[PDB]
Curated annotation (Swiss-Prot), chain A:
Protein name per the record: Ryanodine receptor 2
Membership in a protein family: Belongs to the ryanodine receptor (TC 1.A.3.1) family. RYR2 subfamily.
Top-level taxonomic group: Eukaryota
Source lineage: Eukaryota, Metazoa, Chordata, Craniata, Vertebrata
Record gene name: RYR2
Function comment: Cytosolic calcium-activated calcium channel that mediates the release of Ca(2+) from the sarcoplasmic reticulum into the cytosol and thereby plays a key role in triggering cardiac muscle contraction. Aberrant channel activation can lead to cardiac arrhythmia. In cardiac myocytes, calcium release is triggered by increased Ca(2+) cytosolic levels due to activation of the L-type calcium channel CACNA1C. The calcium channel activity is modulated by formation of heterotetramers with RYR3. Required for cellular calcium ion homeostasis. Required for embryonic heart development.
Subcellular localization, as worded in the UniProt entry: Sarcoplasmic reticulum membrane
Description of what induces expression: By TGFB1.
Tissue: Detected in heart muscle (at protein level). Heart muscle, brain (cerebellum and hippocampus) and placenta.
Organism: Homo sapiens
Subunit structure: Homotetramer. Can also form heterotetramers with RYR1 and RYR3. Interacts with FKBP1A and FKBP1B; these interactions may stabilize the channel in its closed state and prevent Ca(2+) leaks. Interacts with CALM and S100A1; these interactions regulate channel activity. Identified in a complex composed of RYR2, FKBP1B, PKA catalytic subunit, PRKAR2A, AKAP6, and the protein phosphatases PP2A and PP1. Interacts directly with FKBP1B, PKA, PP1 and PP2A. Interacts with SELENON. In cardiac muscles, identified in a complex, composed of FSD2, CMYA5 and RYR2.
Complete-protein stretch covered: 3425 to 3473 of 4967
UniProtKB/Swiss-Prot annotation, chain C:
The record's account of how the chain is modified after translation: Channel activity is modulated by phosphorylation. Phosphorylation is increased in failing heart, leading to calcium leaks and increased cytoplasmic Ca(2+) levels.
Descriptive protein name: Ryanodine receptor 2
Positions spanned in the full protein: 3136 to 3376 of 4967
Induction: By TGFB1.
Superkingdom per UniProt: Eukaryota
Assembly notes: Homotetramer. Can also form heterotetramers with RYR1 and RYR3. Interacts with FKBP1A and FKBP1B; these interactions may stabilize the channel in its closed state and prevent Ca(2+) leaks. Interacts with CALM and S100A1; these interactions regulate channel activity. Identified in a complex composed of RYR2, FKBP1B, PKA catalytic subunit, PRKAR2A, AKAP6, and the protein phosphatases PP2A and PP1. Interacts directly with FKBP1B, PKA, PP1 and PP2A. Interacts with SELENON. In cardiac muscles, identified in a complex, composed of FSD2, CMYA5 and RYR2.
Domain notes: The calcium release channel activity resides in the C-terminal region while the remaining part of the protein resides in the cytoplasm.
Tissue: Detected in heart muscle (at protein level). Heart muscle, brain (cerebellum and hippocampus) and placenta.
Taxonomic lineage: Eukaryota, Metazoa, Chordata, Craniata, Vertebrata
Family: Belongs to the ryanodine receptor (TC 1.A.3.1) family. RYR2 subfamily.
Localization per Swiss-Prot or TrEMBL: Sarcoplasmic reticulum membrane
Disease: Ventricular tachycardia, catecholaminergic polymorphic, 1, with or without atrial dysfunction and/or dilated cardiomyopathy: An arrhythmogenic disorder characterized by stress-induced, bidirectional ventricular tachycardia that may degenerate into cardiac arrest and cause sudden death. Patients present with recurrent syncope, seizures, or sudden death after physical activity or emotional stress. CPVT1 inheritance is autosomal dominant.
Curated annotation (Swiss-Prot), chain D:
Annotated protein name in UniProt: Calmodulin-1
Binding site for Ca(2+) 1: 21, 23, 25, 27, 32
Residues with the Phosphoserine modification: 78, 98
Record family assignment: Belongs to the calmodulin family.
Modified residues (N-acetylalanine): 2
């Protein structure tokens, strides 16, 4: 799962290597926590 | 000659079941391969380390008995006892 | 052909159902004619039954009947009623494997494509729009997805949860905020109950460690994997809402 | 030739060299310098001959000659050095060794050396923990 693909699809309508497969910083749980 | 032949055969067999049971053993695999990753001089030194108790020797009982019998005969020949 | 593929019940098509569902969703997004809603066909300027005229359409191989051009595909209202009674009647996966793998993603893509032509976006000259789709339909179908995934947390662990999560992404755009209290609260409540159960089980298991914990730690690991899979099926929708 | 060469191959070096024999100095000049190993079986090129003549009164003997195959011992050292590893471990053969398997391959055997593993991961750390056994060994088996 690209993980960031959900955020890219969200910011796609508004036009808004080392870490290609996965990244610590963009965890879904911490993303939900920071959005709430 | 014969003693080393039997010892080598036993070591090969032991390495065989160690490789067979590697995935059951998990952590024990490293400790069982410690014997086979040591230089051959040290391998023989630790295989011949059953003169007094010291069960930390992979040598089986029959091979131990063969070596002990020959050692006793050699001591008798030398006249120690 | 693709709808018959999706609806077909065969062990041969069983392992290829998912790709057929994805292709059907793509076709539903790409197709310019509101095939699900045939009754208001005459308001579609791109319809072959509106352009080709009767003589040429009879010369071609067409059923001449707009309702019967795709007879096997049911109407949008009938599909909505079927999905509504699903997730409410206690769905059994033995008879309903095809639904949440093919039919719902098609409806999701169809709604995402046809919402723009719906009367709600352009209330001017209404009743002449190509489709009768509405935001209330969108809310109803999204609530249906939430209810079915609620029923399917602990049963039938598969990739289709994350699949439906990524397919239903466009739906969330025009949701009312009250759908939170309507469905998300029980859903996240049950997810939190599962999380509390699994963390309590982990705490209990951490006390004991011996030669053979494998027969229990495998089950506990399965619990965490299922919890994480449901969590990734859930948090995209909640985040973006 | 520090005991790394085996008895059988040393013997066949000698039998090839004795194919020309002649008291260890005759018929073994720089003209046959290539012919002896051509008859033995692998082919010396210009690089091989220049490696033979790099440190070489003017007529070789058996000590000098087998000293030359010591530096030629450097050849054919690519697959057999990892053949043992591929036999003993990596049953799947993916090369991406799992987490427990990597604990186990660095479970220190007798030496009990330290700071070398943590040095290796502070110098280089893979990402996707998930350390590659291949990338892990070429660094030493360069």
């Amino acid at each position: 799962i690209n993980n960031m693909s959900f955020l890219i699809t969200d910011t796609k309508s508004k036009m808004s290597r080392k870490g290609d497969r996965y990244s610590m910083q963009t965890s879904l749980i911490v993303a939900a926590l920071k959005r709430l | 000659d014969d003693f080393v032949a039997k010892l080598q055969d036993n070591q090969r067999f032991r390495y065989n079941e160690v490789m067979q049971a590697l995935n059951m053993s998990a952590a024990l695999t490293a400790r069982k391969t410690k014997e086979f990753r040591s230089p051959p001089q040290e391998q023989i030194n630790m295989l011949l380390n059953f003169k007094d108790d010291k069960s930390e020797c992979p040598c089986p009982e029959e091979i131990r008995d063969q070596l002990l019998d020959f050692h006793e005969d050699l001591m008798t020949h030398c006249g120690i006892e | 052909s693709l709808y018959a593929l999706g609806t077909s019940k065969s062990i041969y098509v069983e392992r290829q159902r998912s790709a057929l569902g994805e292709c059907l969703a793509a076709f539903a997004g790409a197709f310019p004619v509101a095939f699900l809603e045939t009754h208001l066909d005459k308001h579609n300027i791109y319809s072959i039954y509106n352009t080709k005229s009767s003589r040429e359409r009879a010369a071609l191989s067409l059923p001449t009947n707009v309702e019967d051009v795709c007879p096997n595909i049911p109407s949008l209202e009938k599909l909505m009623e079927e999905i509504v009674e699903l997730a409410e009647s206690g769905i059994r996966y033995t008879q309903m494997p095809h639904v949440m793998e093919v039919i719902l993603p098609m409806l999701c893509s169809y709604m995402s494509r046809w919402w723009e032509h719906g009367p709600e976006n352009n209330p001017e000259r209404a009743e002449m729009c190509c489709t009768a789709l509405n935001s209330e339909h969108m809310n109803t179908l999204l609530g249906n997805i939430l209810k079915i995934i609620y029923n399917n947390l602990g049963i039938d662990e598969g990739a289709w949860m994350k699949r439906l999560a990524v397919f239903s992404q466009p739906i969330i755009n025009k949701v009312k905020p009250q759908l939170l209290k309507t469905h998300f609260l029980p859903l996240m409540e049950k997810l939190k109950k599962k999380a509390a159960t699994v963390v309590s089980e982990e705490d209990h298991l951490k006390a004991e460690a011996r030669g053979d914990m494998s027969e229990a730690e495998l089950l506990i690991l399965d619990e965490f994997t299922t919890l994480a899979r449901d969590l990734y099926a859930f948090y995209p929708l909640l985040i973006r809402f | 030739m520090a005991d790394q060469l085996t008895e059988e191959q040393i013997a066949e070096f000698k039998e090839a060299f004795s194919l020309f024999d002649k008291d260890g100095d005759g018929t073994i000049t720089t003209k046959e310098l290539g012919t002896v190993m051509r008859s033995l079986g692998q082919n010396p090129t210009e690089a091989e001959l220049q490696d033979m003549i790099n440190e070489v009164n003017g007529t070789i003997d058996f000590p000098e000659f087998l000293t030359m195959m010591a530096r030629k011992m450097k050849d054919t050292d690519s697959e057999e050095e990892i053949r043992e590893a591929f036999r003993v471990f990596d049953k799947d053969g993916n090369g991406y060794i799992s987490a427990a398997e990597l604990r186990h391959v660095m479970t220190n055997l007798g030496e009990k050396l330290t700071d070398e593993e943590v040095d290796e991961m502070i110098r280089e750390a893979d990402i996707d923990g998930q350390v590659n056994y291949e990338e892990f060994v070429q660094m030493m088996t360069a």
